[PDB]
Amino acid sequence: KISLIQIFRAHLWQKIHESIVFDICQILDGELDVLQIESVTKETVHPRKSYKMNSSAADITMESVHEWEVSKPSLLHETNDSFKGLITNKMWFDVQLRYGDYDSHDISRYVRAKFLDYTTDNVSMYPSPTGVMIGIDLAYNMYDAYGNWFNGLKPLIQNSMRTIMKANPALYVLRERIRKGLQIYQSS
Amino acid sequence: SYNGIGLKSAKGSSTSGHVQRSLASNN
Amino acid sequence: PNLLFSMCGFEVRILPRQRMEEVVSNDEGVWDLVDERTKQRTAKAYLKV
Amino acid sequence: TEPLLDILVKGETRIQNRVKLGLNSKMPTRFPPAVFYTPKELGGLGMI
Amino acid sequence: NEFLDSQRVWAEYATKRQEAIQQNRRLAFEELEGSWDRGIPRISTLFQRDRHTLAYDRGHRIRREFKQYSLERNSPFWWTNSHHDGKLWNLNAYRTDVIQALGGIETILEHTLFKGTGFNSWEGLFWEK
Amino acid sequence: QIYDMTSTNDVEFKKKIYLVLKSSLSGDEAAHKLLKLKIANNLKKSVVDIIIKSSLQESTFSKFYSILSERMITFHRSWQTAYNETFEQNYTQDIEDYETDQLRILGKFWGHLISYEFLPMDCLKIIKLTEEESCPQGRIFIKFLFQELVNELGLDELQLRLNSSKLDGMFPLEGDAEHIRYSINFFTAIGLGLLTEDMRSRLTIIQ
């Protein structure tokens, strides 16, 4: 417990959660044409929300030009889906951070379980329940997303996640603080 | 069954006390 | 038929081959003692800590 | 020697308990044998 | 098996020393390489750099025994002088086989916090102290 | 189908037998753990190979691998066939690869099982001592074989078993005196020449 306070010091978990949420919306406004969005919005986030595992809220909200046709919710690396089910105007994004163990470090089973639970929950307030939840294990730097896809997001988001997991300063500050505590260096 | 083989108790043994018959020694 | 002694930390049973009353192979905790002129194993030395 | 084999078991598990006393848990599942017996080059204790 | 292997090796060394006297040549040092770590004395002791000054060490066993009265920390090993006997056990094979028994390196690193470091592969990591 | 140019199913099984082998203390312990596995009959030829190859990594013979193999044979007869198939497979095929430090392990290994009747003397009928059908490393394997036969049984008890063996490979009697001159020359080079008294009577009649 002494070490984990030093690794996560000065609200690092909160700073990490704001950093991915910022990096997602600063990508998605760039490809705004192929999405046919009206606007991208980050919502006002309770500072307790980023480390509240009990329930969750939406982080990034989509408003659409035309009414989007989203697939039934599938994994990040799912091959194909039937789009034709749900005609929706509004999609959300949630960034969930967990710290895995040896027993439970499958992000894929975690994100699917959180997505099916939080949508069926009445307490967790999502606008227009279509949209993907993006889960990141901070213990094993894994990442996954599970939710409705309309078109074009799923190749764009996995290009974005492969960047952000390599490119985020706050994840890199986390990786530094782990390496300082472990005292490991890389030769060659 | 406990046929005179094993431990009086596995408490101070620091083992489980699990006893299995030697399949090697039959004939 | 048993000649028993204790060396530096070893407890040794020396049993000759003909007094064995049957000859069985052993695991390697058993020294096979060889006569020099026959080169034949004629006793078994049994070791314990 | 059967009695020596008992002392080897009771001896080695006291050393593993000394690590399990160092951390404040003597739990078995918290300490898989990967913890004790991994060599020092991989971060384990290197116990033989 | 040490001692039975020791008797034949020093028998093999004595003849190979006897052959080099007949051919009046220095021992080839690679002819003997196959039995480098064989023999109870350990044949490698015949080619030590300090073997001339170690020849005058006498009673090194009996002095090593009675070091229990001189010193607090005797040693774990009081039966062998490594200069007079060489190394009598190799445990380098043990380290590799434990890693196989624990399921390989990638299974062991699942237990650890290696992936949280962000390192792509294990190999470059060396250790800090 | 996808063609299987790799044997990763075998390598994982080959790892498991080796880990069983190195985790045991006594020979009866490893014999228990192998029989606990209930290995299928197609692999029981391959398990014997893993035991023998790992007996060559030891760099010295051990009585572990003998009493390991003795508890295999007395358990079920398909183990006993598996060693009998392996002993032919080692002598006819594998001698060309083995160094002389590995042959003294195997000659002491198979000489232990033959001298305690876990393999019969009839398995020695396969081995034949000619100039053509012998390897120079094959002659080394026979030499380390007979010494373990001499040391365990004695010279007279070995004489009785070789007379009940009625083999022709070590013992040519029907003719071909160049092989009789060969076989007397080879056995006396080992150091055992008391058993060659039959051949010298046969040789001088030919002269």
Interface test with D, best of C13, C27, C30, C49 (most D CBs within 10 A): C49
Q: What is the DSSP string of F7-44?
A: -HHHHHHHHHHHHHHHS-SSHHHHHHHHHHH---TTTH
Q: Does D9 touch chain B (CB under 8 A)?
A: yes
Helix H segments across A29-60?
32-35
E39 secondary structure, DSSP code:
T
Tokens 């190999």 sit on residue: E123
Write out chain D residues lying below 8 Å of C49, CB-based: 1, 4
E strand or H helix at F84: helix F77-93
How far apart CA A123 and CA A128 sit, in angstroms, is 14
Three-class HEC string of chain C: CCEEEECCCCEEEEEECHHHCCCCCCCCCEEEEECCCCCCEEEEEEEEC
Strand order in the sheet with C41-48: C3-6, C11-16, C41-48, C30-34
Contact A112, A134 (CB under 8 A): no
Tokens 């008391």 sit on residue: F194
Contact E97, E56 (CB under 8 A): no
Give B21 to chain F, closest Cα distance, Å: 9
How far apart CA F138 and CA F106 sit, in angstroms, is 11
Write out chain B residues lying below 8 Å of D9, CB-based: 13-15
Give B14 to chain D, closest Cα distance, Å: 6
DSSP-derived 3-state class of residue A92: strand
Q: How many CB atoms lie within 10 A of CB E22?
A: 7
Q: How was this structure determined?
A: cryo-EM
Which residue, A27, A143, A28, is CA-closest to A77? A143
How far apart CA E88 and CA F63 sit, in angstroms, is 20
Which residue, F124, F123, F105, is CA-closest to F51? F105
What does this entry list as its resolution, in Å?
Answer: 3.6
Structure tokens at A156: 């764009």
E36 secondary structure, DSSP code:
S
How far apart CA F36 and CA E94 sit, in angstroms, is 25
3-state helix, strand, coil in chain E (%, to 5): 50, 0, 50
Nearest-CA residue of chain D relative to C10?
D1
Contact E31, F91 (CB under 8 A): no
3-state helix, strand, coil in chain F (%, to 5): 70, 0, 30
Interface of E with A in 74-113 (CB under 8 A): 110-111, 113
